[PDB]
Amino acid sequence: SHHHHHHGSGLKWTDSREIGEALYDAYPDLDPKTVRFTDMHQWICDLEDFDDDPQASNEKILEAILLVWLDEA
């Protein structure tokens, strides 16, 4: 998961690096390993830059984001 080059600030479920970085920046001391997909999904949908459909996520998408968060942490 590497950085994309969007011109807009809006993030899509596939922007794994950007979302993971956002979560890390917003919740600096929360251990990503302990986070449940059910909760993370909601936190991502509430991100200011989130610009996708909440229904469009899946476990592969969320695992990618969780792994980026773990890396940033």
Count of structural domains, the chain = 1
Structure tokens at 3: 């950085």
CB-based contact 11:51 (threshold 8 Å): yes
Handedness of CA 28, 23, 26, 72 (dihedral sign): positive
The resolution in Å comes to: 1.8
CB-based contact 46:5 (threshold 8 Å): no
Q: The CATH number of the domain where 51 resides is what?
A: 1.10.10.600
**Domain enclosing residue 37, as ranges:** 1-73
Q: Using CA atoms, how far apart are residues 72 and 58, in angstroms rounded to an integer?
A: 22
Q: Using CA atoms, how far apart are residues 54 and 40, in angstroms rounded to an integer?
A: 12
Q: How many other β-carbons are positioned within 10 Å of the β-carbon of residue 55?
A: 6
Q: Using CA atoms, how far apart are residues 59 and 61, in angstroms rounded to an integer?
A: 5
Which SS3 state, helix, strand or coil, does residue 50 take?
strand
- The amino acid that residue 70 corresponds to is L
CB-based contact 28:42 (threshold 8 Å): no
